Amino acid sequence: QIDRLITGRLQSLQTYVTQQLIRAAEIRASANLAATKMSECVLGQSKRVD
Amino acid sequence: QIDRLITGRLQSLQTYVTQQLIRAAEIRASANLAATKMSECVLGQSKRVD
Amino acid sequence: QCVNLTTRTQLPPAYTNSFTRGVYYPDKVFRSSVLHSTQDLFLPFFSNVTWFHAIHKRFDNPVLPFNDGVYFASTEKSNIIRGWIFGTTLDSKTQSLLIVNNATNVVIKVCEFQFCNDPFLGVYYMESEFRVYSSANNCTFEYVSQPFLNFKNLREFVFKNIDGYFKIYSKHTPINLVRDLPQGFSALEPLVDLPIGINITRFQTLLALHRSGWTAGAAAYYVGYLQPRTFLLKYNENGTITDAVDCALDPLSE
Amino acid sequence: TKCTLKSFTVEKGIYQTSNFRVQPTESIVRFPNITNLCPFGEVFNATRFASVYAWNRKRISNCVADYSVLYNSASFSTFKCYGVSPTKLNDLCFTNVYADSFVIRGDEVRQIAPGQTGKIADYNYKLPDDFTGCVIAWNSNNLDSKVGGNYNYRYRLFRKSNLKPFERDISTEIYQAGSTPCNGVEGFNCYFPLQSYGFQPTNGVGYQPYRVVVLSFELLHAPATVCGPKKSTNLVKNKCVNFNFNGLTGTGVLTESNKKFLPFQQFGRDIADTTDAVRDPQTLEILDITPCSFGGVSVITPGTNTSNQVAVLYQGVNCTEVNVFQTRAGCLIGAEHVNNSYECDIPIGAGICASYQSIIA
Amino acid sequence: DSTECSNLLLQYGSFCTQLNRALTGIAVEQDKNTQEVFAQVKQIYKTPP
Amino acid sequence: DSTECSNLLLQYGSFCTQLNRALTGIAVEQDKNTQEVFAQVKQIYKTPPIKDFGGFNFSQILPDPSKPSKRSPIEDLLFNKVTNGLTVLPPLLTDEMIAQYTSALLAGTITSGWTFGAGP
Ligand SMILES: *[C@@H]1O[C@H](CO)[C@@H](O[C@@H]2O[C@H](CO)[C@@H](O)[C@H](O)[C@H]2NC(C)=O)[C@H](O)[C@H]1NC(C)=O
Ligand SMILES: *[C@@H]1O[C@H](CO)[C@@H](O[C@@H]2O[C@H](CO)[C@@H](O)[C@H](O)[C@H]2NC(C)=O)[C@H](O)[C@H]1NC(C)=O
Ligand SMILES: *[C@@H]1O[C@H](CO)[C@@H](O)[C@H](O)[C@H]1NC(C)=O
Ligand SMILES: *[C@@H]1O[C@H](CO)[C@@H](O)[C@H](O)[C@H]1NC(C)=O
Ligand SMILES: *[C@@H]1O[C@H](CO)[C@@H](O)[C@H](O)[C@H]1NC(C)=O
Ligand SMILES: *[C@@H]1O[C@H](CO)[C@@H](O)[C@H](O)[C@H]1NC(C)=O
Ligand SMILES: *[C@@H]1O[C@H](CO)[C@@H](O)[C@H](O)[C@H]1NC(C)=O
Ligand SMILES: *[C@@H]1O[C@H](CO)[C@@H](O)[C@H](O)[C@H]1NC(C)=O
Ligand SMILES: *[C@@H]1O[C@H](CO)[C@@H](O)[C@H](O)[C@H]1NC(C)=O
Q: What CATH class has C14-254?
């Protein structure tokens, strides 16, 4: 019974960590975009449209 | 018997959803690139090489 | 002792709207400022509840199937409704549960009773007439407790038979409406859980006669049936259920 | 840190190596008041006991039963159980108890047993082969015996067929010893079945009257109303203890609570369905259950080529619950806090950084 | 359509709700992607005849 | 705290180590993200005490000296509009230091143009 609970909770924890890694990749992409906008719009004048 | 079938089908569905999330992240990156090309190549003239 | 009541007036039973009544606390758990979704035997919102009258000449004491649970609503003045009759065959062949509130206390007994076909009490204008049973042979459980009890009082009851446990939920509400069920919200607190362990499939209300033949005092009560469904219950800061959502009523509440 | 990194050399940085736990110190079991005791005083110590052909059956139900007082009593000369254990009577729960009380002879005390064959077993009181419960018997020569002879206790001597288990027979039909017709009229070979005992104070051990109470247990689908006593301990607050409140167990710090429960409510839950509030069953007071201060143990070090000095970070742990400095990241032990500001070398968190120059934070 | 399977599947908790939420997020993300790429003008311009 | 559960959990190996290492990588990645976004200048610039910018008003974006958090009114409104083994590690940069970084960036782009992003 404890083995069933262990494999269920381990599957839940692996699912949480996997979706956290996917969201971390998305947030890293958004933060790389934000650093690019910080460099190009604040620290200079950008010719790039929109 | 249904416990074995349920854990097999749930593992298959979780694998499918994880692969779909990774491919959706890739397609989102491609679409952000395409929106950037739409802004900077169609709506303006770009000095960025290639 | 049994007496046939032969001065009744024939009338079909009535029906009315449940509104948002019949909600009870599903558990003994305090919850603070949270919305809790629970799956239990609940009374459906705005449902068709059976309406019985006692007026003069109406005297509604039939036997109804218990199903999975009973919601009992009572628009009561001068204490006509005194108890309920619980069992399966309501004779000495099986074992039956008796809930009575006489002039002193409430008595709960699980025995083999011989019920009359028309059981009632009676008040002479002083209660001096008890004709609800003729025998009591084999008792297994006795429990004496504190008494639970224009229409001035509203009495809601929920009876459930789950795993040999008899749950009685109740709420007292002061109302001043004349005829029908008032529209509002009142969650029923758990009063007492009974270790009865018996089969119950049929039930019957117990009334009281008024003697001065017989006269039926003005009373009205309502029977609703509990169905397995989901409620989204709202718990306030003080931990009382102030509002509920029936998840299978309409797509908005879904 | 070398054990965690599986290397003998540690690069400069902060490394989460272990997990600080506030270990539970005491066990607190609070169980409600032991009231509504089972009426064993009117069964074992009644005024007059019954005969064995008409043994009195008392139903013990809807009460809590203290078998330790019955078991620790030294007056009982026989305490033999056949389906349960005597030391586990206070732990197990049963639906109901049947108490069969009678008086027999001292030589017939062994005859109340499964598989035992005797006159009392065949004609007066029979136990099944799968009997559960305990048989209790004690000498009653000072009470039942009379100097003129106590003839009030009768017993059945003859019957055509043996008893079924837990079967009574109070009939007074005249037995047929021979094959002669008897219409209830006694004759040469027709005798009355119930005979009186010869209980006298001049009799030795074996003929003295013994009072026997037999407890039988039922384990049907009815709820287990009969349970053993609950030994509740004292309540200890403001410490990381193991709490057991009315079958709800856990580990936490039990502090006073400002949450006013409604009187029908016993436990309290937050949004995430974890029990954070509870009511003590002994005294109706509300207690908050704060989880013990678990934390991550991080080791802040420079390179082992540089130095062997380390600092320890207990994450989210106050410094009074573990060169001691309190940060918003946690308690940092082994680093000297300075008022100067430098560039971040080893990140601690919440604006705190560590560097080596000794280890400063 | 097996109700015993769903009764056993409810013992595993909210895995199915998580998977449906992830697929719903992907499904609305595709429409967001098309909206971001192609709907960069609020005026429908027309060429001269 | 069940020791039998941990004895059975040791049969599955180093799954817990992988989960902890993945979460640690995410946790340091968040601080790296904040470091790449906000810490683009190594000089903390300040505006002059006299706000004579030829009619241009920056009071809604410059830090308010009356507030203890040293935030701009816009940043204060932005911060007002956002509302079992589990631990939350605090971020390495506090909100005060991120506000200080944005104040330095605002002072640089107001007083010095784009010159501070390419040199002195
Ligand atoms: C009250 O009326 C009921 C119904 O007519 C009576 O119950 C019947 O009594 C007769 C008496 O011989 C029986 O043969 C029937 O089988 C009974 N019917 C049922 C459904 O049980 C009842 O006896 C009447 N009460 C009195 C006091 O006469
Ligand atoms: C810059 O803008 C601020 C804000 O709009 C101006 O401050 C206002 O000044 C008037 C009169 O001095 C007051 O009635 C308002 O209450 C002020 N608003 C706030 C939000 O403080 C300020 O005058 C402008 N000019 C300069 C030179 O700072
Ligand atoms: C309730 O039931 C009765 C008969 O069963 C029916 O005539 C009536 O219309 C029902 N009420 C509602 C609101 O459906
Ligand atoms: C109420 O019922 C109980 C049990 O039947 C009885 O003992 C008591 O006397 C009754 N009260 C009156 C006033 O008759
Ligand atoms: C039930 O009652 C009947 C009649 O009173 C009796 O013959 C029978 O033995 C009883 N059964 C039990 C189990 O008490
Ligand atoms: C309860 O009673 C009903 C009708 O009398 C019967 O159909 C059902 O099988 C009974 N259940 C049990 C558990 O005795
Ligand atoms: C909660 O209780 C307090 C006092 O006990 C009262 O002032 C407040 O109005 C209550 N709130 C609700 C929503 O009942
Ligand atoms: C008689 O037996 C009962 C058994 O419950 C016990 O409580 C009581 O103390 C006994 N009486 C004496 C005088 O020992
Ligand atoms: C239970 O026992 C305690 C012990 O003193 C007492 O204070 C309390 O009043 C008793 N009753 C209840 C209902 O807690």
A: mainly beta
